[PDB]
Amino acid sequence: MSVGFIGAGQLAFALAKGFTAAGVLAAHKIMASSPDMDLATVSALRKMGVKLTPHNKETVQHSDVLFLAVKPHIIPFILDEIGADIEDRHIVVSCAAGVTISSIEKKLSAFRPAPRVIRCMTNTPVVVREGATVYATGTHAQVEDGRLMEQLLSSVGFCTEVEEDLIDAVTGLSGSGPAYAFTALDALADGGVKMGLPRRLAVRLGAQALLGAAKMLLHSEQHPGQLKDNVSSPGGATIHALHVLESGGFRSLLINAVEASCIRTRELQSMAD
Amino acid sequence: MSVGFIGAGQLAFALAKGFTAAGVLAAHKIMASSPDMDLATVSALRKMGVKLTPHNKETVQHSDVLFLAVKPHIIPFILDEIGADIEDRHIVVSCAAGVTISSIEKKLSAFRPAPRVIRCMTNTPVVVREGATVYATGTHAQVEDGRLMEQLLSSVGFCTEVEEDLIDAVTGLSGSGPAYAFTALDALADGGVKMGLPRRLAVRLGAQALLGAAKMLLHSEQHPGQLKDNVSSPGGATIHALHVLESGGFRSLLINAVEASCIRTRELQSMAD
Amino acid sequence: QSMSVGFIGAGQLAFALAKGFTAAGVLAAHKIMASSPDMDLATVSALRKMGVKLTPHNKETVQHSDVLFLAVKPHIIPFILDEIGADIEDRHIVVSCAAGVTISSIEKKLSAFRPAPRVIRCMTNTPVVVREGATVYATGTHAQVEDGRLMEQLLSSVGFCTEVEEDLIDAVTGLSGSGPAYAFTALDALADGGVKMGLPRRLAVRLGAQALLGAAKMLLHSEQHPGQLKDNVSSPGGATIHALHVLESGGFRSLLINAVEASCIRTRELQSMAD
Amino acid sequence: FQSMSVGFIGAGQLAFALAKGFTAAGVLAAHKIMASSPDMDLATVSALRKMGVKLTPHNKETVQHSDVLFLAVKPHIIPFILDEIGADIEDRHIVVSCAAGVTISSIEKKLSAFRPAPRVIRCMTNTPVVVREGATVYATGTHAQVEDGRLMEQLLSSVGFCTEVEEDLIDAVTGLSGSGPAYAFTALDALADGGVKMGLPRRLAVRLGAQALLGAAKMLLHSEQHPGQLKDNVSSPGGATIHALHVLESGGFRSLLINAVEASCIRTRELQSMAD
Ligand SMILES: O=CN1CCC[C@H]1C(=O)O
Ligand SMILES: O=CN1CCC[C@H]1C(=O)O
Ligand SMILES: O=CN1CCC[C@H]1C(=O)O
Ligand SMILES: O=CN1CCC[C@H]1C(=O)O
């Protein structure tokens, strides 16, 4: 099979790099297109083996699965540019935040009547094949289309099917989650440096701490609260540090963040509607 | 070689499980001892293949490397119990928080004059072989002793040598860090549930988000701030969520936490001095 | 070259551009004119001693200028356009500096007189006066391609300048348009802190200003983003990382984000209020 | 001073920044500069090599081939350096400590155990010397000749602002201009986040924020006004800027920067007293 990318943002690069690292796709069977392709990401993808072109039309003509990794504002402009080139073989996979299956199908249906559409919310760590992906199938997607999507995106991380009305919430949690983590890792590093550690060592240890904790959770049947309980010894350093987190309302800020991101995602649909 | 554990807390179990999963030690070459061994962790370690005993003395007699995974309060009581049994072959590895190499050597030197002592700060994710470990070598540790320690603890995570005066700070960062992460994952899950996701899915996606983000950081040369910049698209959901984190002082709470844990660790030394 | 520049309005922004353009030597002699209803005598004196021609009639500036800067308050823009509208000619480039006011609304006023007014909208800031301004501009629907290039070269002589899409200008206003006032507020507070710890006020003002200029210049001359530079200069256990913690505890970052957003939102309100 | 050699004990960020500024200003030949450091596997050590600076692992070699000696090491290393090279300090030497908090008195006391009249200067500079826009103060020790202080004023003025102060002000200077660039990097990172939130590309938001701050600082430096008057001058009635100033005030923005200068100054004083 052949995969194409319309758009060349951080996400298209991350997916193409994950797919090739996963060995599920010969990078020569990947094509990308952009309006502005920087001399870096161009040389990044050209050194990767990904054929490029500045015309979205050529990418559609040589690709089977079409990932749309463009800003939600640009999706309808793209769809009306390539809709005449959409064939029956194509599966159109929108990664745009908020943009609904219905709006994409209604644009494409003006050309050929049964577009096969999938909507997905994934994230940048597909680049190291630890992405978190959900997807919903559209009204003309054959059953095999969803199984293919599940197989392909599982090669670069966790992936599961959801009902479309959960995707804005998923965007607030795992779509934006890596930025929450980078912010937390920056701050944990500042705390390590304050108490005397070299910056390099502080960044490394904070990151390894988070990675091991998350893997511990993924590999147990327990919820986060029981694990917190398990590792907080009576009277110890850790329970003292947890108290100062609670005193600033640490937990509510992360709830606030998921909510704010989910709500903004819904606005990005409405503004594009 | 043969490894022994004095104490059977969450840490001794986590290390023994990591070592056996790593295949660096035949679990029959691991011995553990505890004052109170619960019928679970006993059956956990007995099903694992680890020989047990309720006498610390037998564990010393059949082990080469001796991990002391007991509360800092109990260390000097242990040392005066086993000090007469310490032989020239033994390497004594203290995992206790705050307890200094000097205090351990001064206890053991009352018996035989050149105890080989190592101090380390590791964490529970060694159980899934993603620990974060630092260690400092004592005044009679041969050079090979530190290289052995580095090899053994690298089989269950990241490991590096540090000067002893950084270890209290490391405790505040990666020693306590998993609890910070479990707290954050609990709260991120509450945020996902608030916006409509099933609890199971919310826990899974938050954890995968954190793991992928941390792996992304470990696999780039960049610091956390540049990665935050890379994934925050103009006007998007993520930058909106980051603002609400900043408005609650999210960053300062994690700095507060590392500081509080490091300071409490120093108190645990002084109270034991 | 042979080109002439005119200012309608004589507030602090128009003064700052006239002074910066003359310090740049980018125009021939006597090529700058400015007009206003009630110009204060100091501004009259300063501009006159600068070589800038002055007149109370906006029509005179229009008639002797090729590039026309409108540096008046957004509320005043519709009245000026009604006054000068019949005097706008094909050769003219109308550059609006008013916050919020859209190219669309300017072209709509001017088109009732002549059909194809050449309009550019820009957001610049006061430090053009020392040739370190930050300027963005957007071109209107009847601007020739050479009009944007002319504007770029002109405003580059007094600072950074780049073209943007018009829908970014409100956000630029919140960042570099209001930026200098955020900096003056910060420098006043840093000086207060220096004085609290025992420095003379004069020394505290100078040191804080020099620290901010040096820091901004470091960033401009590196490929790095600010986060990496913060990491580079915060030594373990040191005085600087201790002070960064107290900034974080008060949510220092969130306040500057709040400021950019508040200025951008108010700028959007200044368009609609005119519309 | 086309004949004098400059030496750096320490080859870190400050040493690189000064050496780069000194050579960029043409005030010193790079081959007249020598630096020593504990470990050579530093990015700063490699950059010094490429600049033409001579590097050595032995502090005593630096001492023996330099006339002006910059101590660019952490405060708690100063007493260890002074014990190592004290016997090699000759009469021609000017010793310039850049360490935060460490007093002239403590440096002279160590060196005087060897030769009796060490010429010592204490300074507090900052990283922007690397683009020749540093902010520097210095105080002269009890055996410094009058030409030593004016030589110091001459050398450091080539990489930014420089003035002599009484020593009891240097801890305060550290909290203001020593730590100052870090306050600005934090402020620039947040302003860029603000620009991005409102729809600007990140690269453009970084560029515009930096240019705004540079131009503001230069405006202030080039007037006789204090910052308050300039804030008044650029804040038009009912406008976007004054609305934004109000939200800064509502979070106590001014008090946070006062808190910062104070916290850095207090920590600098602790760094001395710990070493004492
Ligand atoms: O209880 C957990 N931990 C991990 C670091 C040391 C110990 C403590 O909290 O004191
Ligand atoms: O910019 C990053 N992301 C990830 C989720 C969607 C997009 C956004 O912020 O709008
Ligand atoms: O680390 C940076 N600096 C600049 C001033 C002194 C030193 C410190 O923070 O202690
Ligand atoms: O008053 C100052 N300024 C600078 C940006 C625009 C204008 C305003 O605040 O509305």
Residue numbers in the entry:
A (entry chain E), B (entry chain E): 1 to 273
C (entry chain C): -1 to 273
D (entry chain D): -2 to 273
Please give the exact wording used by the authors of the publication that reports this structure.
Pyrroline-5-carboxylate reductase 1 (PYCR1) catalyzes the biosynthetic half-reaction of the proline cycle by reducing Δ1-pyrroline-5-carboxylate (P5C) to proline through the oxidation of NAD(P)H. Many cancers alter their proline metabolism by up-regulating the proline cycle and proline biosynthesis, and knockdowns of PYCR1 lead to decreased cell proliferation. The biosynthetic half-reaction is the reduction of P5C to proline catalyzed by NAD(P)H-dependent P5C reductase isoform 1 (PYCR1). Electron density for each analog was present in the previously characterized proline-binding site, which is located in a dimer interface and consists of the αK–αL loop of one protomer and a kinked α-helix of the other protomer. In each case, the carboxylate of the analog binds in the αK–αL loop, while the ring contacts the kink between helices αH and αI of the opposite protomer of the dimer.
